[PDB]
Amino acid sequence: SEKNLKNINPDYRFWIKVEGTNIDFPVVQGKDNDFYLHHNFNKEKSFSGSIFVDSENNLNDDSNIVVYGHNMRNDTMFAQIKHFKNENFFNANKYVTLYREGKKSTFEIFSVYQENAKDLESEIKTKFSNKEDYEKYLKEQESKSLFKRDGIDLNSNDRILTLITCGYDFVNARIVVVAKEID
Protein backbone atom coordinates (compact mmCIF):
# COMPACT_ATOMS: atom_id res chain seq x y z
CA SER A 1 0.00 0.00 0.00
CA GLU A 2 2.60 2.52 1.14
CA LYS A 3 4.88 0.61 -1.23
CA ASN A 4 2.51 1.12 -4.14
CA LEU A 5 2.51 4.84 -3.42
CA LYS A 6 6.30 4.88 -3.18
CA ASN A 7 6.29 3.37 -6.67
CA ILE A 8 3.83 5.76 -8.28
CA ASN A 9 6.16 8.46 -6.93
CA PRO A 10 9.52 8.03 -5.08
CA ASP A 11 9.23 11.57 -3.64
CA TYR A 12 6.54 10.09 -1.37
CA ARG A 13 7.35 10.19 2.37
CA PHE A 14 4.21 9.80 4.41
CA TRP A 15 0.45 10.02 4.71
CA ILE A 16 -1.28 12.75 6.63
CA LYS A 17 -4.68 13.04 8.19
CA VAL A 18 -6.00 16.07 10.03
CA GLU A 19 -8.75 15.43 12.51
CA GLY A 20 -11.81 17.52 11.70
CA THR A 21 -11.05 17.70 8.01
CA ASN A 22 -11.11 15.81 4.73
CA ILE A 23 -7.36 16.11 4.73
CA ASP A 24 -6.16 12.57 4.19
CA PHE A 25 -3.46 12.51 1.57
CA PRO A 26 -0.05 11.28 0.68
CA VAL A 27 2.73 13.77 1.15
CA VAL A 28 5.77 14.15 -1.07
CA GLN A 29 9.19 15.79 -0.78
CA GLY A 30 10.64 17.70 -3.75
CA LYS A 31 14.16 19.01 -4.31
CA ASP A 32 12.71 22.45 -3.69
CA ASN A 33 9.51 24.08 -2.40
CA ASP A 34 8.20 25.00 -5.88
CA PHE A 35 7.89 21.81 -7.96
CA TYR A 36 4.90 20.52 -6.03
CA LEU A 37 3.03 23.79 -6.04
CA HIS A 38 2.51 23.20 -9.76
CA HIS A 39 2.51 19.46 -10.28
CA ASN A 40 0.30 16.68 -8.98
CA PHE A 41 1.35 13.34 -7.48
CA ASN A 42 1.95 11.93 -10.98
CA LYS A 43 4.19 14.93 -11.54
CA GLU A 44 1.97 15.95 -14.43
CA LYS A 45 1.69 19.72 -14.22
CA SER A 46 -1.44 20.92 -12.46
CA PHE A 47 -2.97 24.00 -10.84
CA SER A 48 -3.52 22.27 -7.46
CA GLY A 49 -0.16 20.54 -7.02
CA SER A 50 0.36 18.17 -4.10
CA ILE A 51 0.93 18.24 -0.37
CA PHE A 52 4.69 18.55 0.19
CA VAL A 53 7.04 18.51 3.10
CA ASP A 54 9.80 21.10 3.22
CA SER A 55 12.52 19.97 0.81
CA GLU A 56 15.21 20.64 3.41
CA ASN A 57 13.47 18.61 6.16
CA ASN A 58 15.41 15.66 7.47
CA LEU A 59 12.47 13.61 8.69
CA ASN A 60 14.65 11.60 11.09
CA ASP A 61 16.44 14.44 12.82
CA ASP A 62 14.53 17.68 12.61
CA SER A 63 12.51 19.09 15.50
CA ASN A 64 9.93 20.69 13.18
CA ILE A 65 8.36 19.01 10.22
CA VAL A 66 6.98 21.61 7.84
CA VAL A 67 4.24 20.68 5.37
CA TYR A 68 2.73 23.01 2.72
CA GLY A 69 -0.60 22.87 0.89
CA HIS A 70 -2.90 24.85 -1.44
CA ASN A 71 -6.05 26.50 -0.18
CA MET A 72 -8.23 27.30 -3.21
CA ARG A 73 -11.47 27.36 -1.25
CA ASN A 74 -12.88 24.27 -2.96
CA ASP A 75 -12.53 21.63 -0.21
CA THR A 76 -9.35 20.24 -1.77
CA MET A 77 -5.83 19.90 -0.36
CA PHE A 78 -5.31 22.14 2.72
CA ALA A 79 -8.50 24.13 2.03
CA GLN A 80 -10.30 23.03 5.20
CA ILE A 81 -7.41 24.07 7.41
CA LYS A 82 -9.41 27.32 7.38
CA HIS A 83 -11.81 25.90 9.98
CA PHE A 84 -9.18 26.12 12.72
CA LYS A 85 -9.70 29.92 12.73
CA ASN A 86 -13.01 29.07 14.34
CA GLU A 87 -12.61 28.85 18.09
CA ASN A 88 -15.19 26.08 18.51
CA PHE A 89 -13.78 23.99 15.67
CA PHE A 90 -10.31 24.42 17.20
CA ASN A 91 -11.50 23.32 20.64
CA ALA A 92 -13.19 20.29 19.20
CA ASN A 93 -10.50 19.17 16.75
CA LYS A 94 -7.06 18.36 18.03
CA TYR A 95 -5.01 15.67 16.31
CA VAL A 96 -2.93 15.26 13.19
CA THR A 97 -1.69 11.87 12.25
CA LEU A 98 1.29 10.91 10.15
CA TYR A 99 1.92 7.39 8.90
CA ARG A 100 5.51 6.75 7.85
CA GLU A 101 7.33 3.53 7.07
CA GLY A 102 4.65 1.39 8.66
CA LYS A 103 4.46 3.60 11.72
CA LYS A 104 1.75 5.95 13.04
CA SER A 105 2.56 9.13 14.94
CA THR A 106 0.09 11.55 16.48
CA PHE A 107 0.45 15.30 17.14
CA GLU A 108 -1.81 17.59 19.13
CA ILE A 109 -2.54 21.03 17.70
CA PHE A 110 -1.59 23.86 20.03
CA SER A 111 -1.35 26.89 17.75
CA VAL A 112 -3.25 28.53 14.92
CA TYR A 113 -2.39 31.87 13.39
CA GLN A 114 -2.22 33.85 10.17
CA GLU A 115 0.69 35.76 8.80
CA ASN A 116 2.13 37.49 5.77
CA ALA A 117 3.92 35.04 3.45
CA LYS A 118 7.33 36.73 3.39
CA ASP A 119 7.24 37.44 7.07
CA LEU A 120 6.40 33.76 7.60
CA GLU A 121 9.17 32.47 5.25
CA SER A 122 11.79 34.19 7.35
CA GLU A 123 10.32 32.99 10.66
CA ILE A 124 9.68 29.30 10.07
CA LYS A 125 12.49 27.04 11.18
CA THR A 126 13.29 23.37 10.66
CA LYS A 127 16.87 23.54 12.01
CA PHE A 128 18.04 24.59 15.46
CA SER A 129 21.49 25.48 16.89
CA ASN A 130 20.67 24.42 20.46
CA LYS A 131 17.95 23.74 23.00
CA GLU A 132 17.41 27.34 24.16
CA ASP A 133 16.66 28.69 20.69
CA TYR A 134 14.39 25.72 20.09
CA GLU A 135 12.60 26.52 23.35
CA LYS A 136 12.38 30.19 22.35
CA TYR A 137 10.98 29.22 18.96
CA LEU A 138 8.40 26.95 20.61
CA LYS A 139 7.17 29.69 22.96
CA GLU A 140 6.76 32.16 20.12
CA GLN A 141 4.64 29.71 18.03
CA GLU A 142 2.46 28.98 21.04
CA SER A 143 2.20 32.66 21.99
CA LYS A 144 1.04 33.58 18.49
CA SER A 145 -1.91 31.20 18.64
CA LEU A 146 -5.31 32.74 18.15
CA PHE A 147 -6.48 30.20 20.79
CA LYS A 148 -5.01 28.47 23.84
CA ARG A 149 -4.91 24.68 23.98
CA ASP A 150 -5.26 23.75 27.67
CA GLY A 151 -2.64 21.62 29.38
CA ILE A 152 -0.20 21.20 26.52
CA ASP A 153 3.10 21.37 28.45
CA LEU A 154 5.21 22.65 25.57
CA ASN A 155 8.97 22.18 26.08
CA SER A 156 12.33 21.71 24.35
CA ASN A 157 12.03 17.89 24.28
CA ASP A 158 8.98 17.99 22.07
CA ARG A 159 8.87 17.45 18.34
CA ILE A 160 6.45 19.55 16.30
CA LEU A 161 4.61 19.60 12.99
CA THR A 162 3.71 22.77 11.15
CA LEU A 163 1.09 23.05 8.43
CA ILE A 164 0.95 26.06 6.14
CA THR A 165 -1.57 27.04 3.53
CA CYS A 166 -3.09 30.13 1.84
CA GLY A 167 -5.35 32.55 3.66
CA TYR A 168 -7.65 35.17 2.18
CA ASP A 169 -8.20 37.81 4.88
CA PHE A 170 -5.36 39.97 3.50
CA VAL A 171 -2.95 39.89 0.58
CA ASN A 172 -0.44 37.04 0.77
CA ALA A 173 -2.02 35.67 3.94
CA ARG A 174 -0.88 32.29 5.12
CA ILE A 175 -2.63 30.24 7.77
CA VAL A 176 -0.47 28.11 10.05
CA VAL A 177 -1.26 25.24 12.45
CA VAL A 178 1.36 23.85 14.80
CA ALA A 179 1.18 20.56 16.66
CA LYS A 180 3.23 18.72 19.23
CA GLU A 181 3.97 14.96 19.14
CA ILE A 182 2.25 13.07 21.98
CA ASP A 183 2.17 9.55 23.55
TrEMBL record:
Site residues, Transition state stabilizer: R174
Keyword Cytoplasm annotated: no
Active site: H70 (proton donor/acceptor), C166 (acyl-thioester intermediate)
Keywords: Hydrolase
GO molecular function ontology, one term from the record: hydrolase activity
Protein name: Sortase B
Organism of derivation: Clostridium perfringens (strain 13 / Type A)
Highest classification ranks of the organism: Bacteria, Bacillati, Bacillota, Clostridia, Eubacteriales
